[PDB]
Amino acid sequence: ETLWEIAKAEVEKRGINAEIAEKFVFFIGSKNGGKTTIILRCLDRDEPPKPTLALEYTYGRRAKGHNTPKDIAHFWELGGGTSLLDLISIPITGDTLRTFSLVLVLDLSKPNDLWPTMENLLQATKSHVDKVIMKLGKTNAKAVSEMRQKIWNNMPKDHPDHELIDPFPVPLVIIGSKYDVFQDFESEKRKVICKTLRFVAHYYGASLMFTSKSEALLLKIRGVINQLAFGIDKSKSICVDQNKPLFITAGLDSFGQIGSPMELWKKVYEKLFPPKIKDPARDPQYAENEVDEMRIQKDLELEQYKRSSSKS
């Protein structure tokens, strides 16, 4: 009697705070943007990138040195303006929102042609994460209030919190890809690109860093968001001056200095680059028994799948 009641009382008392729910990060990008290589490097692997992308799943483990806690970091990704919410909604659940972070990768090749891709994916994530905080019917939402106040008091750490330029309730880091093309851009094009790259970071309060092979900052900064996988914050100064490397600590990039909105984007868009069938009929085809059976199969299988009454 009292033996199990107390045992129950202890597992009830405990349960607030192997490791506690591990974090995971999702990679917004395009298809064949080089982002697969970036992810695989975050896993500290040398494997050739996979062509396809359909919520690819991979993870790894880290230790601390006093022990091996087996800190697992999960990785999810999607590329291109394909099945936006149908797939974005899959790896993201409200129960783990506080443990969820985004990183957005942009191919420098054609920022304009890539902009609707990342924008659509980003909107899908933004809308989704905003809802799941209470869509689950989380009555005891105190945690929801706490975690939101954390996110919107991490970047305006010291600077007076004048306004939340865009309430964005999930961590975000932004980075380009294949900067090898940037050195070959026209001076005028590099400048207008810099305006938007600088702006978008401070707009979301998302840090920036470069991407290369010898560049350890990529692994480091990614590691921080990935459960300190490659160290700690190690906040450095903004590199808006050199423009050769890339690095921005969110909070030091005040608009008045880095930009010096709608008008900014419109201007950069116009200057940088403005030029931004299934045949179900099967008419040139014929068959008699093959098409008759296919019609039969279609009906019978479709009705069977409905009858399964799956809750999924």
């Binding site: 009697e1 045992a7 405990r14 899959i90 999924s312």
Partner: protein, 192 residues
């Protein structure tokens, strides 16, 4: 012909894959799957990955020609992923539900019962009840299923029962030794 069977697979991937077996025990006294949970997730994802990659390597008649005639079906039926992944998550939840059931079934922490018995037990009436309740819980343990199954996975539950049975006997031994010392102590007091 291929697209039809392709569509069929996409709807029932959570049902028709080869079964995976896992053993459930208490590693470090903590309820855990062997192999770990994150591991079987990765295997499950790889299994569906292999299927959906099929419409890429299909040497249909006239292999000298283009192959896109087939692989186009992937994009055209990309909507199927929603159902696949939704069912995948539901299956994972079902596995967790089994996990939790056993965690609630018997608490293994087993706090040190020495303090408890001293506080408010050895009351002759309630004290005997503690023996009876333990016997009753043992009888319940004797009915624990030896295995559980979901759509594509089997779970061995005997390691769980094994650990639990040990706990049952240990609790009994504590009760018996505790009463012995309690009664003897009373006798020492009056004898003094």
């Amino acid at each position: 012909a291929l697209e039809h069977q392709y569509q069929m697979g996409l709807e029932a991937l959570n049902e028709n894959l080869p079964e995976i077996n896992i053993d459930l025990t208490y590693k470090q006294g903590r309820l855990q799957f062997r192999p770990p949970f994150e591991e079987i997730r990765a295997k499950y994802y790889r299994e569906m990955k292999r299927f959906i990659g099929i419409p890429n390597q299909f040497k249909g008649v006239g292999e000298a020609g283009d192959e896109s005639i087939f692989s186009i079906m992937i994009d055209r039926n990309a909507s199927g992923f929603l159902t696949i992944f939704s069912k995948a998550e539901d299956l994972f939840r079902r596995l967790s539900a089994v996990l939790h059931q056993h965690k609630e079934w018997i608490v293994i922490g087993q706090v040190d019962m020495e303090a408890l018995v001293e506080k408010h037990l050895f009351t002759v009436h309630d004290w005997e009840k503690n023996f009876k309740a333990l016997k009753i819980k043992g009888k319940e343990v004797e009915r624990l299923p030896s295995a559980v199954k979901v759509d594509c996975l089997n779970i061995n539950c005997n390691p769980v029962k094994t650990v639990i049975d040990d706990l049952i006997q240990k609790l009994f031994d504590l009760l018996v030794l505790s009463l012995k010392k309690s009664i003897q102590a009373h006798l020492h007091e009056i004898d003094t």
